[PDB]
Amino acid sequence: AQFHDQLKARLLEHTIPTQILRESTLAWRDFKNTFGAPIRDFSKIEGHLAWTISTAAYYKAGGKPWKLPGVCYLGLVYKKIQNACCAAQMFLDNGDGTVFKGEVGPWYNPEKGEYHLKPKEAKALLTQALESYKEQNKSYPKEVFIHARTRFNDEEWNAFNEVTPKNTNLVGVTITKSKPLKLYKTEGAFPIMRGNAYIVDEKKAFLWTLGFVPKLQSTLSMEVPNPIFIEINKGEAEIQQVLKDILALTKLNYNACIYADGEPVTLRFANKIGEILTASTEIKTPPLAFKYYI
């Protein structure tokens, strides 16, 4: 179970991009179920398959396939080991480049199930993101966007707003999946098109990051879509702009060449880097770039 993550973690100290491909993946005709079709039937997706691998390769070889100001998107995720908080970051350069580095150096919360970040660790994480923004864009961010698969406590939020500098607004968002609102469509046989959202409240809403797409004339998700519940529990912001930002974050999946993923890419990337990091022993100042984990 733990080959891939441990291998990447043991490769981290010497920064070398690596892509792991299964032998049953590249030549999937050979490996049959011994009674019929191959174990991995990829005929309908082969070309798209040849897309993603290629894109992944082109990402790990130092290429930027596609890009997306003054806003730092800092999506953090907790990992159960003691707990480890690890984040993924993105900004926008002065030269219109979209820096999509990570936020690594996981912060250890000793409580077994408290998916909350300790005050000192929260200060360290937020100030690390701030210094990354300063060294990247030569000035402090106008806005930092923190979002996670969890709600946020109070005392930690005091730590965030006390470590942050002036002229810096922080908004905390929680994205949760499989919230039981499986909205269908009355007229047709095809589900609600992706891009539609139900505003439950001024701070909470539902978003359909996945579903029917006009351009593809098909659904990103089979059966019925599972909308993501987006709750602005802490911080101040308007629901439309945050919803736009979440839909934009659902575009930067460099791990695959797919139209869009059902969850924001920032959380998924932070989660993957966290899985790789906690797979093996502790390493100081890890690479922090996703070509080494993803």
Binding site: L7, G47, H48, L49, G62, K67, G195, A197, L247
Partner: protein
């Protein structure tokens, strides 16, 4: 009865300043932003895995068609999309011949031997795991 608003889909940029919503079509039409000259691929695995990777990398140059070309766009071919060479005959191959720990360690130490000791440069190592 509650309204369902629509958020305009964000445009992911591509080469020549042109924007599109689907990454596949945007890549196959305009291409990626920065041009690497080529991918010096590295491979770690058995000889049969090398044959599989080489055949697949040869197929990548050709175009592969999805069964539903209008739902998921097809692959033009690697050089067609990215404009960088990833041929299969210029690969740096390293043959191999608690169980998770030593299974990882084989690839770890072979890859470290190749990156450190060997002269040939590798942009990214394609570990072709067995099955």
């Amino acid at each position: 009865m509650k309204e369902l608003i629509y958020i305009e889909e964000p445009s992911i940029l591509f080469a020549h300043g042109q924007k599109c919503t689907d990454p596949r079509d945007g890549l196959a039409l305009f291409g990626p932003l920065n041009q690497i000259y080529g991918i010096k691929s590295g491979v770690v695995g058995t000889q049969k895995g090398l044959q599989i990777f080489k055949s697949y990398l040869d197929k990548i140059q050709k175009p592969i068609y999805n069964h539903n070309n209008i739902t998921r766009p097809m692959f033009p071919g690697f050089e067609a999309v990215f404009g960088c060479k990833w041929e299969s005959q210029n690969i740096v191959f390293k043959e191999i011949t608690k169980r998770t720990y030593d299974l990882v360690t084989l690839f770890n130490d072979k890859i470290i031997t190749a990156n450190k000791n060997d002269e040939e440069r590798v942009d990214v190592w394609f570990v072709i795991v067995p099955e």
